[PDB]
Amino acid sequence: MEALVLVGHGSRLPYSKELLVKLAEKVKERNLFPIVEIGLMEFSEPTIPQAVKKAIEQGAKRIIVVPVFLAHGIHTTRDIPRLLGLIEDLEIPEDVEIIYREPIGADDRIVDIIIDRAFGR
Amino acid sequence: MEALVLVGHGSRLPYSKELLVKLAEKVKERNLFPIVEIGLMEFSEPTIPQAVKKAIEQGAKRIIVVPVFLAHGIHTTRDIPRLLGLIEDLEIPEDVEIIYREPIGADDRIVDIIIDRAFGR
């Protein structure tokens, strides 16, 4: 009924996709959502429209798109809102409403993790 | 003696740099290292070399660089190790050695944070 779509930059190296796959798995074992799909913005599959479509065909009527990026940038302000038919100027999504969330930001867990990496953990 | 450098991507919008600034402040407040600096790889200032340099002239002999990026990609494998004279292409005194850490990766706290964002927290 609601779907969670985890959405990333995408890269030509495979670490970006692998990252989304690991994150998707980990939330799958939290058993919080009916449906969980990942989408990558650029040069990697699946794409964000493929993921949105997949959510819909799986039954879901309220789609939560969460951008897995550290800060706002072009992609989160122009490219993605476009790709979702949320901004006026290859895909439009039937009768279902799209719910576009905020990025990660300067979160305290991110400082936690930074300390860990600094000590070679 | 030891320094922490936080290093980020950078963008033409200012949110990425602002994000680094917040992160740097917050780790300063945990009082863990003698020095803390930031650099931005692209567009903005300070630059990564400016940051490394800045730490050195301030006394630091082991420089711990943490890449504030979600996955390995080009920047964490090529651009940043380059900028730190870690791969043959930055004259650093042989009395100082640079220690390059892991990115964030698919850490469990990142799944925590993603759940929060999915709820609009």
Curated annotation (Swiss-Prot), chains A, B:
User: Part of which pathway?
Assistant: Cofactor biosynthesis; adenosylcobalamin biosynthesis; cob(II)yrinate a,c-diamide from sirohydrochlorin (anaerobic route): step 1/10
EC category: lyase
Q: Which residues form the active site?
A: 9 (proton acceptor)
Query: What one GO molecular function would you report for this record?
Result: sirohydrochlorin cobaltochelatase activity
Q: Which residues bind Co(2+)?
A: 9, 75
Name the catalysed reactions.
Co-sirohydrochlorin + 2 H(+) = sirohydrochlorin + Co(2+); Ni-sirohydrochlorin + 2 H(+) = sirohydrochlorin + Ni(2+)
| Keyword set, alphabetical order | Cobalamin biosynthesis, Cobalt, Lyase, Metal-binding, Methanogenesis, Nickel
Q: What InterPro entries does the record tag this protein with?
A: CbiX-like, SiroHydchlorin_Cochelatase, Sirohydro_Cobaltochel/CbiX
Give the residues the record marks as binding substrate.
45, 70-75
EC annotation from Swiss-Prot or TrEMBL: 4.99.1.3, 4.99.1.11
Q: Which domain of life is it from?
A: Archaea
Q: Does the keyword Lyase apply?
A: yes
Q: Where does Ni(2+) bind?
A: 9, 75
* GO annotation, biological process: anaerobic cobalamin biosynthetic process; methanogenesis
What the entry lists under Pfam families is as follows:
CbiX (PF01903)
Q: Any stretches that span the bilayer, and where are they?
A: none
Subunit-structure text: Homotetramer; dimer of dimers.
Record-stated family: Belongs to the CbiX family. CbiXS subfamily.
Q: What does this protein do?
A: Catalyzes the insertion of Co(2+) into sirohydrochlorin as part of the anaerobic pathway to cobalamin biosynthesis. Involved in the biosynthesis of the unique nickel-containing tetrapyrrole coenzyme F430, the prosthetic group of methyl-coenzyme M reductase (MCR), which plays a key role in methanogenesis and anaerobic methane oxidation. Catalyzes the insertion of Ni(2+) into sirohydrochlorin to yield Ni-sirohydrochlorin.
Give the protein name, as stated in the record: Sirohydrochlorin cobaltochelatase
Q: Give the species.
A: Methanocaldococcus jannaschii (strain ATCC 43067 / DSM 2661 / JAL-1 / JCM 10045 / NBRC 100440) (Methanococcus jannaschii)
